[PDB]
Amino acid sequence: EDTICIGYHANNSTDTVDTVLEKNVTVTHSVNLLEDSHNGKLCLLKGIAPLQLGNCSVAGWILGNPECELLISRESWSYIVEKPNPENGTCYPGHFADYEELREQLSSVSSFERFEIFPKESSWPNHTTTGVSASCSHNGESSFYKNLLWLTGKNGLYPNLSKSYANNKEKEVLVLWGVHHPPNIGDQRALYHTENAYVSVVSSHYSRKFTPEIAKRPKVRDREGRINYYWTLLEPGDTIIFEANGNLIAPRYAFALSRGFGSGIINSNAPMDECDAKCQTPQGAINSSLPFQNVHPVTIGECPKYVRSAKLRMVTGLRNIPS
Amino acid sequence: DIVLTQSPASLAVSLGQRATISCKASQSVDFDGDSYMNWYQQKPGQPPKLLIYTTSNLESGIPARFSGSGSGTDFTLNIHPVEEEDAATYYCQQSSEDPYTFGGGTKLEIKRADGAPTVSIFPPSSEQLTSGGASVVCFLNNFYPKDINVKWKIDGSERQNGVLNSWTDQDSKDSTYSMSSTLTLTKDEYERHNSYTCEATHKTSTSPIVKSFNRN
Amino acid sequence: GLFGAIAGFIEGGWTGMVDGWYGYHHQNEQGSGYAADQKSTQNAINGITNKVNSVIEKMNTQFTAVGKEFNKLERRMENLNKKVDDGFIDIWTYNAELLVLLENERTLDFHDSNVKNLYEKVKSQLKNNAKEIGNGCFEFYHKCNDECMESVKNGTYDYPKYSEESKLNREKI
Amino acid sequence: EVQLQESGPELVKPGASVKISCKASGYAFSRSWMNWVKQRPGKGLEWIGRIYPGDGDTNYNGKFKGKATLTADKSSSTAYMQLSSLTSEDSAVYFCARGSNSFAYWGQGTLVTVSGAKTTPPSVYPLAPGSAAQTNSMVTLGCLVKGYFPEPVTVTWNSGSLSSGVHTFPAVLQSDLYTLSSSVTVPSSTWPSETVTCNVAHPASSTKVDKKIVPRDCG
Ligand SMILES: *[C@@H]1O[C@H](CO)[C@@H](O[C@@H]2O[C@H](CO)[C@@H](O[C@@H]3O[C@H](CO)[C@@H](O)[C@H](O[C@H]4O[C@H](CO)[C@@H](O)[C@H](O[C@H]5O[C@H](CO)[C@@H](O)[C@H](O)[C@@H]5O)[C@@H]4O)[C@@H]3O)[C@H](O)[C@H]2NC(C)=O)[C@H](O)[C@H]1NC(C)=O
Ligand SMILES: *[C@@H]1O[C@H](CO)[C@@H](O[C@@H]2O[C@H](CO)[C@@H](O[C@@H]3O[C@H](CO)[C@@H](O)[C@H](O)[C@@H]3O)[C@H](O)[C@H]2NC(C)=O)[C@H](O)[C@H]1NC(C)=O
Ligand SMILES: *[C@@H]1O[C@H](CO)[C@@H](O[C@@H]2O[C@H](CO)[C@@H](O[C@@H]3O[C@H](CO)[C@@H](O)[C@H](O)[C@@H]3O)[C@H](O)[C@H]2NC(C)=O)[C@H](O)[C@H]1NC(C)=O
């Protein structure tokens, strides 16, 4: 006739949660802890855009694989995106020594200064800077690496070169060179005019003398003879010296680089859409508010932890039992 | 309001023959000398096309093999002869009283000779692998009739959890069905096997049709 | 559930009472309605939202997990890298799912506790002036007022004022 | 020559409102009644309401009298329809049609969707035969479309150049993400001799992505 009643709220939300004692229980109020949505684009970390390599590999990037020309002078970036199967790697067949480390070292870096370490005009006068391969084609035209110089002989001679570079750039510089192994001894006599060739590159923290080895090889990219690539990071203040009498593809452009943190290598086919989200994945960017995302394992910068779970909802309210 | 009860619900007529569709009505659809009843053609993925208006008037363009007839509480539609194109669903529609209402709809199936599915199986893409998952698709194109059964065997052991099947409606120029099956396995569990087989048991053969692949 | 109140002797939830999670009804002679207990519902929201904010805080966000790429002759390292990544994902996934499955019961049990605790707070005031009838309801043996309906909620009921009147009506049931 | 062009597919959360548009051209728009019909997947066609763009005179189905509102723009020759407080049952395909007692000319139809997930574009994965075995003079090819929430996707082949027996299977939902497949049947002589790209579109996110299919690898 005249009463007081104690009860507990019920709402029309169908938010379902799983507990230890039972599962799939409908609840008044819930919060989702798992972020389950991306956008499938390549945003700009923080404000600095990525470096989309596109067709090129990181190998063809640094050496300037002539089909990679327009992605040069892009020295400001937040992270580098490679196609999973890059079909423009090293134009000249051969071995790229310590590829993976240079790949890893060029993941921390955030700035280059592409500078001419050995200017062609005033550093290789006696020799021939006109070294072009047919394999490194561009516009149906023979070209070569736009960061190295194929040094052949001039006027039939090829004297002992002994140039050197002092690291006066106050930062770590990354020098790149190549050693030649001609197809047969005949071309070795014609390119460098010495059957006993040597290339040494020496610094305060590096010394490796290269001897070439001319032999028959399987044909790759139509050029039988192979070029072998090598690299070294000069400490600020040391001097690297190059001396040779044959088979040296010397650097022309080196990279004075400043390390940073926050960048890496993602490979994906996503498009770039100028969307400035706080963290990227190969399959897009994360809304970034939650503490758990299952979109993809590989991430770049201030994403939530990756857990391979379907849904993680936390009960904030209580059991929903309406009329 | 008026409810248009349409008969039959499913229909199958062989080529070069007549097809009859009835449409009863809760009330009499008659309006000052004519019957405000219309028929429509809806092929899958398309909006309805207007066939017959005011219970017998054929609209221009569409061929003269379509016949609308009837008066009062019930009307009929004839197709003579039925063509391959006519693989679609058909609705009746009254326009006498607010609100205008449609019938339940009926699907026209063309009876043709039986067929054998041309089976195709594709491995997951390399880019798909990087997503933390992988899916093998088994295409079954150009068979007849509907009934077909696909079974997935991972290294010979039949797998039934994680399959996804979707059928296509009859081709408008082939009188022909298709369907596709997809296993959605994890990236890790996909790489724990080599033999991936999808067998299809059909009316066209006593023993199942099989096509498969290995990762080498 | 665990204290017998939620989905127990309070068989269902009130579709009304949007004011909060817990409350009273007080079907009176003047007018019925709903009124949520602001005291116990503010403790509940302040505790659950501290639970949730505590949980995320213990998991600092991860930065720039890129995935190392090894060559054709370092398979031992590559398989090692997989285990140290898939291993962490195995732990973090497992260590997160159970944190959800476990603490969701504690959120439901905590609501079951609060209602049970609140139902006894009303009982301890209405000692013999009322009876228990509809499993969470009290019959006023003294014909309470809206003044006195608010005078059962904020610690504002006393037996003595209505006791002897209540003592009268108990003798006929 | 008379065409009703409809708007794009839309996605909204329950309780919100939408304007769907239908622009007319090819006839005297100012003079003929406009119509809206609702088709739930599977269930039957339902007529909604009518606008007469000469006078703005409206007729409303007794069922839809509160859910739908109709207007028109005479200068722009466009018809607008507004739906309020959308629920699950309103998720369907909506058609704009012209006619008074016989719905004559129909629109394209948009698929407005009402659910919890969000707009995500799909990834496209090519599907190569894999085994180098000639099943016949023909080889079947295809593209898979995974992970996209709002339903409409259109799969063309070489920008629609290949109409020869192309199949587009209906999408299937897995954990709030539609996935579907497409196939072709191109002569084995002209593949991989000639480029076979599949062109897919997701109108709900304005994303067009291509992927020429190529044979598999390990070679
Ligand atoms: C940047 O990226 C682009 C795109 O990939 C590159 O262009 C690509 O170049 C390659 C190589 O030139 C092209 O592939 C060749 O295409 C030509 C047609 O012009 C064709 O003749 C050639 O056949 C080769 O493939 C066979 C497959 O194994 C080889 O085995 C074969 O060699 C055999 O036969 C000779 C006969 O003398 C023997 O001597 C050999 O030993 C061997 O037995 C033959 O060489 C390839 O198919 C490719 O087509 C082209 N891309 C496009 C889209 O066309 C650029 O080169 C790259 N940039 C740089 C600087 O590298
Ligand atoms: C990156 O490399 C890929 C190949 O690895 C390049 O794809 C190529 O794209 C071109 C178009 O730019 C295709 O060329 C032809 O186009 C004409 C148009 O007239 C058409 O008649 C041909 O059928 C063909 O489509 C070429 O086929 C395609 N490559 C292959 C192997 O099919 C891409 O262009 C490169 N991107 C950059 C920025 O360098
Ligand atoms: C190419 O190499 C030749 C060497 O075969 C360079 O020629 C001469 O090199 C010397 C030593 O570097 C230069 O010094 C001068 O030598 C003369 C010898 O009589 C001496 O009298 C001088 O006091 C001085 O020490 C010499 O200037 C140089 N000659 C010329 C004409 O340049 C040559 O410079 C190299 N480059 C080119 C472009 O030829």
CB A75 within 8 A of CB A258: no
Q: Please state, in angstroms and rounded to a whole number, the distance separating the CA atoms of residues A227 and A91.
A: 10
The secondary element (H helix, E strand) that includes residue C170 is: helix C159-170
- Burial bucket for residue A122 (CB in 10 Å: 0-12, 13-18, 19+): exposed
Cβ distance D126 to B184 less than 8 Å, yes or no, reads no
3-state secondary structure chain A: CCEEEEEEECCCCCCEECCCCCCCEEECCEEECEECCCCCCECCECCECCEEEECECHHHHHCCCHHHHHHCCCCECCCEEECCCCCECCCCCCCECCHHHHHHHHHHEEECCEEECCCHHHHCCCCECCCCEEEEECCCCEECCCCEEECECECCECCCECCEEECCCCCCEEEEEEEEECCCHHHHHHHCCCCCCCEEEEECCEEEEECCCCCCCCCECCECCEEEEEEEEECCCCEEEEEECCCEEEECEEEECEECCCCCEEECCCCECCCCCCCEECCEECCCCCCEECCCCCCECCECEECCCCCCEEECCCECCCC
Residue A262 Cβ < 6 Å to ligand 2: no
CB B84 within 8 A of CB B172: yes
CB C113 within 8 A of CB C2: yes
Both tokens of D165, joined, read 């027996």
Residue spans per domain, chain B: 4-111, 118-214
CB B126 within 8 A of CB B135: no
Q: What is the CA radius of gyration of chain D?
A: 21
- Burial bucket for residue B164 (CB in 10 Å: 0-12, 13-18, 19+): middle
- Give me ligand 3 centre to Cα D26, in Å: 87
> In terms of Cα–Cα distance, which of D35, D31, D63 is closest to D49?
D35
Both tokens of D158, joined, read 């070489």
> In terms of Cα–Cα distance, which of D145, D143, D140, D144 is closest to D164?
D140
- For B4-111, CATH gives 2.60.40.10
Residue A64 Cβ < 6 Å to ligand 1: no
Q: Which residue of B has its CA nearest to A268?
A: B127
Number of other CB atoms surrounding residue D94 within 10 Å = 24
Number of other CB atoms surrounding residue C103 within 10 Å = 19
Strands (E), C13-128: 22-24, 35-36
Residue spans per domain, chain A: 1-42+274-323, 43-273
> What is the sign, positive or negative, of the torsion defined by CA atoms of B9, B15, B17, B18?
positive
Ligand 3 pocket residues where CB is under 6 Å: A 125-126
Same topology for domains B4-111 and B118-214, yes or no?
yes
**Domain B118-214 falls under CATH 3.60.110.10:** no
Q: Please state, in angstroms and rounded to a whole number, the distance separating the CA atoms of residues A178 and A64.
A: 13
Cβ distance A291 to C89 less than 8 Å, yes or no, reads no
Half-sphere exposure of A23 (CA within 13 A, CB side): 3
Question: Which domains occur in chain D, in start order?
Answer: 3-114 (2.60.40.10), 123-212 (2.60.40.10)
Q: Please state, in angstroms and rounded to a whole number, the distance separating the CA atoms of residues C30 and A268.
A: 70
Q: What is the CA radius of gyration of chain A?
A: 29
Strand partners, D47: D37
CB A115 within 8 A of CB A256: yes
CB B86 within 8 A of CB B172: no
Q: Which CATH number fits domain C23-170: 3.40.50.10800, 3.65.10.10, 3.90.20.10, 3.40.50.720?
A: 3.90.20.10
Q: Please state, in angstroms and rounded to a whole number, the distance separating the CA atoms of residues A293 and A307.
A: 6
Q: Please state, in angstroms and rounded to a whole number, the distance separating the CA atoms of residues B87 and B146.
A: 14
Q: Is B122 left (phi over 0), alpha (psi -120 to 50) or beta?
A: beta
**Residue A286 C-alpha, separation from nearest chain C C-alpha, in angstroms:** 13
Number of other CB atoms surrounding residue D182 within 10 Å = 24
The secondary element (H helix, E strand) that includes residue B197 is: strand B196-201
CA-CA distances (angstroms) from residue D213 to A34, A85, D124, D132, D142?
A: 34, 14, 10, 15, 8
- Spatial neighbors of A144 by CB under 8 A, at least 6 apart, are A66, A91, A131, A132, A133, A136, A150
CB B169 within 8 A of CB B157: no
Helix C75-125 / helix C38-57 crossing angle, nearest 10 deg:
170
Amino acid letter for position B15: L
The b/e string for B166-177 (b: 16+ C-beta within 10 A; e otherwise) is bebbbbbebbbb
> In terms of Cα–Cα distance, which of D82, D113, D93, D152 is closest to D11?
D113
CB B24 within 8 A of CB B76: no
Q: Please state, in angstroms and rounded to a whole number, the distance separating the CA atoms of residues A81 and A283.
A: 12
Both tokens of D5, joined, read 């062009």
**Residue B132 C-alpha, separation from nearest chain D C-alpha, in angstroms:** 13
- In this structure, the strands spanning A51-54 and A80-82 are parallel
Cβ distance D102 to B54 less than 8 Å, yes or no, reads yes
CB D97 within 8 A of CB D103: yes
